[PDB]
Design a protein around this ligand. Structure first.
Ligand SMILES: CC(=O)N[C@@H]1[C@@H](O)[C@H](O[C@@H]2O[C@H](CO)[C@@H](O)[C@H](O)[C@H]2NC(C)=O)[C@@H](CO)O[C@H]1O
Ligand SMILES: OC[C@H]1O[C@@H](O[C@@H]2[C@H](O)[C@@H](O)[C@H](O)O[C@@H]2CO)[C@H](O)[C@@H](O)[C@H]1O
Ligand SMILES: *[C@@H]1O[C@H](CO)[C@@H](O)[C@H](O)[C@H]1NC(C)=O
Ligand SMILES: [Cl-]
Length: 705
């Protein structure tokens, strides 16, 4: 009475085959106050299924101490989908990639003894099985699986482990075996899937991800053809442009897949959202997760893409009866034109007329009628006759975005951050350089390295107007070199090269000298074989040269450590622990100073609109509102990349339609109304680089045609 299964044609919910349309929405990348609106917009967008990852490190920050409150209430979210009459594809992982901090693993797991991630490792296996069954049990015990009348029609184990397995060989294959048996062994009564996993054992369905997945078939002829990630654009990286994917192209790619026995297809993302706080975004991943998704980062309709995929869906749902009661038969129409036809014994008949020419329109003749086909398009004919839809004929209105002010300036106070120097009292030292995560345990982005440099009077450069040459190599991702409380300079990396080098002249008077290195991380890596074994922080080499000696290796001497900022230790970001300290009001408030906290109370503007903070006057740091981290800001990181103009037609790659070059990577920083009170709201910014807070404005977001 309540079962979901499959055959060679589709997933089978309660005995019937379904052509399921899905979309991705990650619950922590929005707020619970938004979830109903998103979900409603999704359903009205033509969606039958809501897809989401589970965010393990979000859910178990401490070993033992679990979190499921607020925007991490996973159970709350799914029931909100069920109340909408939509199904859920629950991609549990626990590895999730997702452009999410460390790929979803909690950092503490790294330091469990004997541990190795994503392999045939028994400490990893027990931990993963633990969190997985914990999550399956949770679903079970609120009867959320379709087996029990709930919305979960399938669950995913691991995530795209196939390419990693190829690289690591035998233990990888053992591991995927273990993971599949372990996951189905939880006896969920709905099917399990793995993406990018041809290896996948019965009864698990292997799926694919990509911009296009139409030539995919799964690894047994009795499993159905499922597309778990239709990439609806790309992610934004700090220092990169805003990537876009044209809607005619997404439609063509989906039509192409459905036309050749596509049965299940999920957009990634449908709502991308925001990487709030400092434990969400991954290595160099912008705070904005817009992704050119059908619902934009703020929850608004991204037209025309939203409406165009809505209409695609409508044409599919008209075709669905023919589609579940027949198979795809192809017929040549031309050198780059085909027809894919689903003729049922019953008599239902749907056909897809396609034109793979990326340059020229084409007219074909199909069952006595002509049909024009624009370049790079498919027409859907749910009755083998009427061309109700064509992937390239967009009949929704465009909609430009307007970010319009709502503040125009506020009343700011400033508190300046300690610039620490090495000290004989210092608690936490060692005789060499320590890897950052090992010291901070991802407790803060910031990790001070401090050491003493003895400079005697004999030294030659003291008489002449010379300076000695300091050279600091570090695994990433930002570095500020401080020489006797003097900031000498700042260096930073990229998503593809987070390693950095400072090398320059430093003023060292006679006596003991104080070298202080602040070493910043920008999220942790989330993808790559053994990505969890890459380093952050300074591990050198570190050398001082131009002296009576040749060069002095500062890496073989004593170093002191301070984890995080003093302002963090005083919790200057919260409601309670905010006014513990000496803040500076009025004209004395610091401009263009590095390592500076700011403060301001504001009232919630008028309107329904969603709101962001314009941060273009700022450099880099973290934003907080009423003690809740909006997330990192880095407008000082201007976007690089070849981003010339775009046509929907032709094979899409993610660099094809890029926008926003020469501008801040992210300038507007989404503020959830869900977090504001009508008056008395606390805004706390830690500016890292240097900025002018009097430029910080709120803005209202609105789209018009
Ligand atoms: C699961 C399923 O039926 N898939 C369809 C395929 O069957 C179909 O063609 C298949 O082609 C093979 C060689 O032409 C045959 O060996 C195979 O038996 C045949 N399937 C059937 C049921 O006869 C493809 C063509 O795209 O569509 C799939 O939907
Ligand atoms: O891009 C966001 C989305 O991509 C997926 O990862 C793909 C792919 O599936 C991996 O096998 C491939 O190695 O790299 C790309 C992205 O780096 C992933 O499934 C999602 O979680 C997201 O990262
Ligand atoms: C790892 O962690 C601790 C500090 O928490 C430190 O004592 C230890 O030496 C570190 N080891 C390495 C190899 O970095
Ligand atoms: Cl997802």
């Amino acid at each position: 009475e309540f079962s979901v299964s499959y055959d060679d044609r589709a997933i089978i919910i309660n005995g019937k085959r379904k052509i399921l349309i899905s979309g991705s929405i990650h619950y922590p990348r929005s707020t619970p106050q938004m979830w109903p609106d998103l979900i409603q917009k999704a359903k009205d967008g033509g969606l039958d299924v809501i897809e989401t990852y589970v965010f393990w490190n979000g859910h178990e920050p401490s070993p033992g101490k679990y979190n499921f409150e607020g925007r991490y209430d996973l159970v709350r979210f799914i029931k909100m989908v069920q109340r909408a009459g939509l199904y859920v594809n629950l991609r549990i992982g626990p590895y999730v990639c997702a452009e999410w901090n460390f790929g979803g693993f909690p950092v503490w797991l790294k330091y469990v003894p004997g541990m190795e991630f994503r392999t045939n490792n028994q400490p990893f296996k027990v931990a993963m099985q633990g969190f997985v069954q914990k999550i399956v049990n949770m679903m079970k015990s609120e009867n959320l699986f379709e087996s029990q009348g709930g919305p979960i029609i399938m669950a995913q184990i691991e995530n795209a482990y196939g390419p990693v397995e190829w690289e690591i060989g035998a233990p990888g294959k053992a591991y995927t075996k273990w993971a599949a048996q372990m996951a189905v062994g939880l006896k969920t009564g709905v099917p399990w899937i793995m993406c990018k996993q041809e290896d996948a054992p019965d009864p698990v369905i292997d799926t694919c991800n990509g911009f296009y997945c139409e030539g995919f078939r799964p690894n047994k002829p009795y499993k159905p053809k499922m597309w778990t990630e239709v990439w609806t654009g790309w992610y934004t990286k700090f220092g990169g442009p805003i990537p876009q994917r044209p809607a005619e192209d997404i439609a063509f790619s989906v039509a192409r897949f459905v036309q050749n026995n596509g049965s299940f297809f999920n957009y990634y993302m449908y709502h991308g959202g925001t990487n709030f706080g400092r434990t969400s975004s991954g290595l160099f991943i912008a705070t904005s997760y817009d992704y050119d998704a059908p619902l934009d980062e703020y929850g608004l309709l991204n037209e025309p893409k939203y409406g165009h995929l809505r209409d695609l869906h409508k044409a599919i749902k008209l075709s669905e009866p023919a589609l579940v009661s027949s198979y795809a038969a192809v017929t040549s129409l031309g050198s780059n034109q085909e027809a894919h036809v689903y003729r049922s014994k019953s008599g239902a008949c749907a056909a897809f007329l396609s034109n793979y020419d990326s340059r020229y329109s084409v007219k074909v003749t199909f069952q006595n009628r002509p049909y024009n086909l624009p370049p790079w398009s498919i027409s859907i004919l749910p009755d083998c006759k009427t061309a109700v839809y064509n992937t390239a004929q967009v009949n929704s209105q465009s909609s430009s975005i307007k970010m319009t002010p709502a503040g125009g300036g506020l009343s700011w106070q400033s508190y300046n951050e300690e610039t620490p120097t090495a000290d004989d009292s210092d608690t936490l030292t060692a005789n060499g350089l320590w890897e950052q995560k090992n010291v901070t345990r991802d407790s803060s982005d910031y990790l001070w390295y401090m050491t003493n440099v003895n400079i005697a009077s004999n030294e030659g450069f003291l008489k002449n107007g010379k300076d000695p040459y300091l050279t600091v190599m570090s695994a990433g991702h930002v570095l500020h070199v401080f020489v006797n409380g003097k900031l000498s300079g700042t260096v930073y990396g990229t998503l593809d090269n987070p390693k950095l080098t400072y090398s320059g002249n430093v003023k060292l008077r006679a006596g003991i000298n104080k070298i202080s290195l602040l070493s910043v991380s920008v999220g942790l890596p989330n993808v790559g074989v053994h990505y969890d074994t890459w380093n952050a922080g300074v591990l050198g080499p570190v050398t001082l040269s131009g002296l009576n000696e040749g060069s002095r290796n500062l890496a073989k001497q004593k170093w002191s450590y301070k984890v995080g900022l003093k302002g963090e230790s005083l919790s200057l970001h919260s409601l309670s622990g905010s006014s513990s300290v000496e803040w500076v009001r009025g004209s004395l408030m610091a401009q263009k100073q590095p390592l500076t906290w700011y403060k301001a109370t504001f009232n919630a503007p008028g309107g329904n609109d969603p709101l962001a903070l314009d941060m273009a006057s700022m450099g880099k740091g973290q934003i907080w509102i009423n003690g809740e981290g909006v997330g990192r800001h880095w407008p000082g990181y201007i976007a690089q990349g070849d981003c010339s103009k775009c046509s929907y037609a032709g094979t899409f790659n993610e660099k094809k339609c890029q926008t926003n070059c020469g501008q801040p990577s992210q300038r507007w920083y989404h503020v959830p109304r869900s977090w504001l009170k009508p008056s008395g709201n606390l805004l706390v910014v830690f500016e890292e680089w240097g900025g002018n807070p009097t430029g910080i404005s709120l803005v209202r977001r609105s789209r018009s045609a």
